[PDB]
Design a protein around this ligand. Structure first.
Ligand SMILES: NC(=[NH2+])c1ccc2nc(C(=O)c3nc4ccc(C(N)=[NH2+])cc4[nH]3)[nH]c2c1
Ligand SMILES: [Ca+2]
Ligand SMILES: [Cl-]
Ligand SMILES: [Zn+2]
Ligand SMILES: [Zn+2]
Ligand SMILES: [Zn+2]
Length: 223
């Protein structure tokens, strides 16, 4: 997250860190046995770490649980990143408390202008590399689909939306991938892609979760 702030320990209790020996992607807890992340974060051998703040220090509120199964969206296209969403089932149910909580799926899609909260442990430098150990946050508004499409001609589909600032300076970045974009108490997006990080007129592009609620509900009930 570039141009954001330190969230505060466990202030985003639904945020997860996907670890395969190191943190490589974020995710959101949707109920005690399932996590939603991005399909471009798919790997075999994932351990889900809940209640994290500093990912290099065990502070006492963590739960490390291995995944029993991963399900990449049937229509995920790795070249265009269309349908960039995947579900991860935990081997054991997580224990929900104040530090570990699930986030609600949306009942409708959010409007351009709505302010959201994006969080993650990804790179914090636009022109540089600095990976933080504690969770960073960023408040950003959903942009109109026209500014999103004019920034990425022929690359945005109906399953994606842009959020951020066209002036540059604030954005999610590599490492934040698969993590949450929460607007009005609902999970509306998943960190997917963008051009570099925090560049002017290159906002971040997010998976539009409201288009996948039936697929999510149907898949978790059958797995
Ligand atoms: N397991 C891997 N090998 C892997 C996982 C995630 C990755 N993610 C990128 C990436 O290259 C990448 N993820 C991004 C997310 C947001 C933005 C943004 N500017 N908003 C830019 C991004 N670039 N490479 C990745 C490789
Ligand atoms: Ca920790
Ligand atoms: Cl640790
Ligand atoms: Zn990359
Ligand atoms: Zn990524
Ligand atoms: Zn990139």
């Amino acid at each position: 997250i570039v141009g954001g702030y330190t969230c505060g320990a466990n202030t985003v209790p639904y945020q997860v860190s996907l670890n395969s020996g190191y943190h490589f992607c974020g995710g959101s807890l949707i109920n005690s046995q399932w996590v939603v992340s991005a399909a471009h974060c798919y790997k075999s051998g994932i351990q889900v770490r809940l209640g994290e703040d500093n990912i290099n220090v065990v502070e006492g509120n963590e739960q490390f649980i291995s995944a029993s199964k991963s399900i990449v969206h049937p229509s995920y296209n790795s070249n265009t990143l269309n349908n960039d969403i995947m579900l991860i089932k935990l081997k054991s149910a997580a224990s929900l408390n104040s530090r570990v909580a699930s986030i609600s799926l949306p009942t409708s899609c959010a409007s351009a202008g709505t302010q959201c909260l994006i969080s993650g442990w990804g790179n914090t430098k636009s022109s540089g590399t600095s990976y933080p150990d504690v969770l960073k946050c960023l408040k950003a508004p959903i942009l109109s689909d026209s500014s999103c499409k004019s920034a990425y001609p022929g690359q945005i589909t109906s399953n994606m939306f842009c959020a951020g600032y066209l002036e540059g300076g604030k954005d999610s970045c590599q490492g934040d991938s698969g993590g949450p974009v929460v607007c009005s108490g609902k999970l509306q997006g998943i960190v997917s892609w963008g051009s570099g990080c925090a560049q002017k007129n290159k906002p971040g592009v997010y998976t539009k979760v409201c288009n996948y609620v039936s697929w999510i509900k149907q898949t978790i009930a059958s797995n």
